[PDB]
């Protein structure tokens, strides 16, 4: 034969082929050699995740193309999201290598799962088919089940894995039932930009079976994004999983699911916009209302960050709701880019605090300013950026998200977003209020015996690449959007 | 090499035709076709024949040769996803009976095949003898299959 | 029967060049772009009317041109012959506007389409009229 | 209205009262037109589509021919019945030559079915 | 048709044990007794009812077998289409076989396949 | 066998009719339905493989193009019946025999599948008639025995393990367990679990 | 013919599987009901490929991939079940409500 | 290319009744062993449905893979549960099951009111060109092989990566 048609198409997924090669090389070296070294695992994970971006940036100017016979679409929209996934993995590897090593467990398996979830998240970003919109998030969800229970000994992690596996088998089967309904009442078409035509060809675009597919797809996607009553999987899993994996599932899962939701609600479901618009409006209003209200009654930091994430996802949903006309998708990014730094910094501070301290309760965060002023300053900056406080990234991100909402006439959505943002100050201020307690009687012995130690550690560099971003991107919110309105 | 590939003659006096296929090939049941033989190892390399009822007395009653050959290739002999082209069209005549033998390539996005198809009309039947080989191995076998397509004969039942 | 009411002004009339397959067509605007490529996704704008000039479908109703893979039988035979060409029909070019008269045997045949809940979208043996407009070849990025 | 073929086949089969003769004759005409249009699918050797069409049209005809006996006058009602039986037999042969598919025999039974249904329309008028 | 014989053969193959059971029921006598119906435990009176609860490390090959069954199922259509296509499917399935080999090596080295 | 018939010819027929006339014994402690269903499932899933065996070019009941793959798929089902028989008997020996049968099938299903896959790759078809004719192209030298010796030995060993013949008679090992999964089985069901073995 | 009845059965299976997913007091049974739901989806896919995709067989390929995913889930758990039973010696999922 | 009509419909009804019985056995049995054995009946009936439609390869793949899955499921249910417990026998009914029965009945009614209202035969006559097979590909498994090898390349390697990672995670999690 020629092996050429696939060879020229195989260069289009070369950034993912780099991840696959790094995965295989890491696995082969782990199997071949008995001894284990932290620096080599660090090097291979980093050089796998900094060569994919090197190849992806070299592929930015290239023409958009649909390769592997209607299976992989490369254009401007998915490239940004793939870069976001790679950035999340790159800033989560230092979060993971220290944490899993301090738990005395095998780390090559953890890096393998993270790299596979990144590989399955990059494929979900451009997945121009219905089979690969199922297989790729099953390359992510299965690894997420393998993660978050990698602890394997804590009684919390087993229950978290049970809940995650059962609820994500409940979803991603409703999603595929919707895929089957959409594929049946279309004429046997599965490519994304070929089933609206197939629907007209069979004249079933107003069939009652199309509403079932839309509802099932929206439910199966809103499970992964976790807005609205599809949110219950989030806090328990966020409360009973190791911190690096939950940070990864906080930033990497929302990016891939946002990309899939944007490419599944606009390309194959534009004829029925008046239905999924209402579904997303309900899904967002309920998300902000019931993610900002419950977060103010939280005694655990990871669970509070879970309710925080299910609150901030509703702000991003407005970008899908307004549509591509009044910016819209250009406001999904330039806020998800913000959200990544916000959450990864506020999780890196939690990682360091828990490792040096050994706790997760919020009440043990008292008096951290006296012990480690740098960590308290960084965590406070991350939390204030999370609350949309003025000189930090969240404020400009939220006003960008609300400008397009007001421009599209969605006064109710913007009003609910602003009211929930007001509610979203009491938390992200409660933690700081604890952090600035000089009362020695209210200071828990968890932070009384706290050693900062005269070494830098990797997470400090990883969140110094972040805290300086959530504050100094506030002038650079003109460079980012001109890369995000350029896509269409 | 010795004498060329030896062929075996298949004669159906009940259905009133006769053609000639390579002796290395084996008989097998094509779906709904009257007769078929195929290579024992290679795929898409086979001869088949099925006939349909008709009221015409000769192929010349089907209209102009090139036009009806093209409409049969596009509409009947090819799936909608297969791009077709015809590279050779010939007419032969023996015993007052005319046979239209044309070579065409069907290039699906998955795979490519090449066929020698001989049409005849006699005994109230329309015969559609077809010789098929994969395109990758077409150039080697084309002559070795053309002898098949030039061997199609229809007589009185 | 299940016609969604869409108010649209009509297109200029024509003399229909009937072909062997029964399709009628005219070139309202001859496109200056690339002709409709085989096995390629193309965005076109159409206004599908029944007989007696009642519109039952339109890509302007959904707000964006329809994307279909042309030349490989993913639409009705009349639309494929009108757009991709063949059998005496020249292929349409980018920017070209063309009227089409699809007979019942080139359309949905004697079987109604879109039948559910006590009504069907297209009746049996219906001649369709299409004011198709080749907007262009599909690209991942819009300007 | 469309009077048939507008919902799932099992619902119209089991949960509908049935058709009046004035709609049964129209369904006979539509079945004949569909059989006439089936020739291209028969020539392309698509046996699954043809077998689905044949089974559905058989299930239509078993009701429609029985319920259209009223419109036939008494002077022809026996002969029409004979023609109806003939049509059934022909379609049965067509069935037998699409499952276990053959080309020549299915085409022969297709032409026979077309002639029988044209005679049935001639009787129904 | 090539598959109605399959259905008839399946029906006959299912009917045969039913015929055997019916013939045994109408031919063999019944002479049930409380000693006869007791579970056989080599003469001695059985203790608690059965049940063994194997170790996990013994039965960890089954998780390998589940994956390997899928891999060998996926390898069949490639072999069916190996001749119609060319070296493209060879390159395609080479990665599949290599991943299978790497997984087998991992199971071997990690002690999953050890008893 | 010398006395049951001329040269023991009627010995196995005598065994079958004796098992027919032997009282059908059911366990009171266990489950009746699983007990009755197990051997029937095993014999059905073993008998279903005879549909594709050709004794001539056309002396085959069904030349299914799925072919040997369907044989593997239906032969995979019998160990479920063996496990059902082991669980339903409520006997420790039966439980051990059922678990051993499941482990044996799990171990030896894959090499047999790959050996069949190699032959199908060589013959380019899954049908048995196509495989035999592809062998018959080159005659005696065209047999896949000479071209694929490694697959030949592995297929022999895997088939011997799936048939549970010695040295792979562990689920029915008479010296370790009294009769394995057949320990509590009497009458026609033991004959069924005997037939199924010899049919395999 | 009454082929649409298959669709009905698939829907029934889905609902039944959904029911068995909720009232499950044993996580092995919950995994089995997940297999039931995926099987209903696969039934829909196969009958739709029979209906509309006799050439491309996209529904059959999707069914094969769904079977692969279901087996991957059936391999990941009960390994998760193994970890849970090693740590807690209990399987009943409704009894574990520590994270709440 | 099908069975006779009445035979096909009778097989549909019979296999549907068997499937309903198996699913009800799955969702009504306390013992995971008994419900697994009912699941096996469901698997066999679904494979027979695949054979009925046209899927002679998907049926075999279903049988092989899902039979391995149920055998593993029975092994791990024996290994991870209490005593054999034939006395458990149809676990008790609570209010929490009664409300979900109503919810699932409503969901099934919503699905069946769409299935029974959509003319599925009307869609078939519109997708005519999707049912014109290539005449050279007589073997259906040959078509499935060609379209698995060429049309779906990216999922074909993605599933390999998924299977490898799932194997590794299953070994790592379940190890003692
Ligand atoms: C208070 C902070 C902002 C101070 C006022 C901003 C104006 C600064 C100079 C004027 C101007 O046009 O700058 C224009 C700057 C330059 O920022 C960007 O630079 C790009 C260069 O590759 C291009 O010129 C872009 O168009 C431009 O927007 O716009 C800003 O975003 C100002 C802040 C720059 C980042 C500082 C950290
Ligand atoms: C590099 C990755 C693996 C190799 C991919 C394909 C092998 C390259 C040669 C292909 C040519 C071929 O068909 O194999 C030849 C035999 O070559 C080999 O066997 C070389 C490969 C050795 C080992 C590779 C397999 C194991 C890995 C037979 O010669 P031919 O003249 O019949 O073919 C010429 C023409 O290109 C046909 O398309
Ligand atoms: C944003 C970037 C995030 C990734 C890098 C975080 C900082 C890592 C760092 O500072 O280096 C560490 C990692 O350094 C290494 O050993 C690995 C080499 C550097 C890896 C990180 C950078 C890689 C990327 C560099 C550029 C690309 C190079 C490859 C391509 C040309 C230091 O490790 P150590 O030697 O202190 O570790 C001791 C160990 O924990 C004891 O058990
Ligand atoms: C193209 C192939 C590139 C392979 C690069 C691997 C490399 O640089 O060699 C490593 C591996 O070299 C070795 O010493 C191992 C032998 C080679 C292993 C690779 C074989 C498979 C390659 C595919 C380096 O070892 P290390 O000092 O970082 O420690 C790793 C060790 O295995 C575990 O601690
Ligand atoms: C943490 C990120 C902060 C934001 C960084 C902003 C950077 C400043 C603003 C840059 C605007 C100019 C870039 C606009 C698109 C350029 C497209 C292009 O041609 O890119 C080339 C250069 O590639 C890049 O550098 C693209 C990376 C920038 C765009 C994406 C940034 C990250 C996403 C932000 C979110 C292609 O690479 P090549 O080597 O094939 O091309 C050779 C030559 O340069 C042009 O022919
Ligand atoms: C003018 C507005 C200044 C206050 C808002 C602000 O920029 O954020 C913080 C101000 O940030 C700083 O403290 C300055 C260092 C980081 C720089 C952040 C931006 C400074 C203002 C930029 C221009 C506006 C406020 O919190 P804090 O960090 O003071 O909290 C107490 C801390 O833990 C004590 O260590
Ligand atoms: C008439 C059918 C019965 C019949 O043929 O009887 C024989 C067979 O019937 C049966 O015993 C039952 C089996 C049915 C066959 C019994 O004779 P045998 O072969 O046991 O004795 C012959 C000689 O003395 C020893 O070989
Ligand atoms: C027991 C082993 C003896 C040999 C068994 C050969 C297989 C057999 O008995 O069946 C064939 C036997 O074939 C015969 O007809 C031979 C009958 C005599 C067999 C003598 C042994 C079926 O082939 P067929 O093409 O006729 O199948 C039926 C066909 O589709 C029509 O229904
Ligand atoms: C082949 C299929 C055979 C038909 C199976 C169903 C038989 C008719 C329904 C009876 C119910 C039944 O079999 O239930 C048993 C469980 O059923 C099964 O497990 C059989 C189905 C497994 C089929 C495996 C196919 C693969 C035991 O439960 P019970 O309440 O009837 O028990 C009463 C008492 O304890 C005595 O046993
Ligand atoms: C003839 C067909 C009619 C016409 C009716 C069917 C009759 C039939 C063929 C009935 C069942 C016959 C089998 C076929 C009956 C059971 C045969 C097994 C199959 C019998 C088991 C006997 C052992 C008991 C057989 C093998 C055996 C031999 C041996 O020497 C030793 C030491 C051991 C431990 C063994 O197990």
Author numbering:
A (entry chain B): 20 to 507
B (entry chain 0): 77 to 232, 248
C (entry chain 8): 89 to 231
D (entry chain 6): 74 to 198
E (entry chain C): 5 to 119
F (entry chain A): 66 to 265
G (entry chain E): 1 to 100
H (entry chain G): 1 to 176
The article reads:
In the thylakoid membranes of plants and cyanobacterial chloroplasts, NADPH dehydrogenase (NDH) is homologous to the mitochondrial NADH:ubiquinone (Q) oxidoreductase (complex I).
The supercomplex consists of 41 protein subunits, 154 chlorophylls and 38 carotenoids. In addition to the subunits found in cyanobacterial NDH, we discovered a previously unresolved subunit that we identified on the basis of its resolved side-chain sequence as NdhU of the SubE module. NdhU is centrally placed in the SubE module, establishing electrostatic interactions and salt bridges with subunits NdhI, NdhH, NdhK and NdhJ on the stromal side and potentially with NdhA on the lumenal side. In the spinach supercomplex, Lhca6, NdhF and PnsB5 stabilize the connection between NDH and PSI–LHCI-2.
